[PDB]
Design a protein around this ligand. Structure first.
Ligand SMILES: COc1cc(Nc2c(C#N)cnc3cc(OCCCN4CCN(C)CC4)c(OC)cc23)c(Cl)cc1Cl
Length: 284
């Protein structure tokens, strides 16, 4: 279902990010003048990565949610692949953390929107597998969406569990590290680590080497949120960070958690965080 001739429909503007698979560019939909994000992958400097690229695009093309980065299409241009997504100008939740701490209203608001994305994803039998603040993107007006489906997985009727070692070590669930059969409950663990990350600025063990973390997480007791935080926020985290995945709540259940219900407000209030980052970055 790939398409061709991207530059007929889109204008490529300036570079805004890179991994080393390919680079991400700002761009324009010349049919609407909406701004988009364009990822270009030289299909040559990657080889093993080709199958993971194909899976990512598949997952993206099948998602239709206001809580998941909208996918425009994938375009072939000679040796290059262009992946076109909506542009989100507010930066990531991680960016928003850089100038300083969040309050519990902002934390609950962000967590609630992530939970709506996870509920959508999990209802579609998809697992994100790399939930973390850096993969939570915001519009300039504070809309919050899940991004970066580079390791997302799909459950089917013949495959009701996954086994693959993927994720970012600090955020990974213990059953994923063990490469046991796991499912969407793994995203709920990662969400718990993410809530600590939103609260503390960093996930547990963040000063350790990622490889060391891979043996610590299955053995150690689960992280808890320590410090002067509300009881419901601490219990939200604790609920998520159960070593036994069937004891973790679903995303749907967490949307009704006391911490969420008591503290989450309108996403438009998150523009304050967006302004704060812009001010912070400018004077950097
Ligand atoms: C296209 O394909 C993909 C793109 C992405 N990533 C992004 C998506 C998406 N989706 C959307 N929006 C993004 C916006 C970004 O920048 C907003 C920052 C505001 N300004 C930038 C310019 N400066 C000078 C002023 C401040 C951004 O930066 C790296 C990455 C974004 C992912 Cl994660 C996966 C795939 Cl496949």
């Amino acid at each position: 279902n790939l398409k061709a001739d991207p530059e007929e429909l889109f204008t490529k503007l300036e570079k805004i990010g890179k991994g080393s698979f390919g680079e991400v560019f700002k761009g324009i939909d010349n049919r609407t003048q909406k701004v988009v994000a364009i990822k270009i992958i030289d299909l040559e400097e990657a080889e093993d990565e080709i199958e993971d690229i194909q899976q990512e695009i598949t997952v993206l093309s099948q998602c239709d949610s206001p809580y998941v980065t909208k996918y425009y299409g994938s375009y072939l241009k000679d040796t290059k692949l262009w992946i076109i997504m909506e542009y989100l100008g507010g930066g990531s939740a991680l960016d928003l953390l850089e100038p300083g701490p969040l309050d519990e209203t902002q934390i609950a608001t962000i967590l609630r929107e992530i939970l709506k994305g996870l509920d959508y994803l999990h209802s579609e039998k998809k697992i994100h597998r790399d939930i973390k603040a850096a993969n939570v993107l915001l519009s300039e007006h504070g809309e919050v969406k899940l991004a970066d489906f580079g390791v997302a997985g799909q459950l089917t009727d013949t495959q009701i569990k996954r086994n693959t070692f993927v994720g970012t070590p600090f955020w990974m669930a213990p059953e994923v590290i063990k490469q046991s059969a796991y499912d969407s409950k793994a995203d709920i663990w990662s969400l718990g680590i993410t809530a600590i990350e939103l609260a503390r600025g960093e996930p547990p063990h963040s000063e350790l080497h990622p490889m060391k973390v891979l043996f610590l997480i299955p053995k150690n007791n689960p992280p808890t949120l320590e410090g002067n935080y509300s009881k419901p926020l601490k219990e939200f985290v604790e609920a998520c960070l159960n070593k036994e995945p069937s004891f973790r709540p679903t995303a749907k259940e967490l949307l009704k958690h006391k911490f969420i219900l008591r503290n989450a407000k309108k996403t438009s209030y998150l523009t304050e965080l967006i302004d704060r980052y812009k001010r912070w970055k400018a004077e950097q």
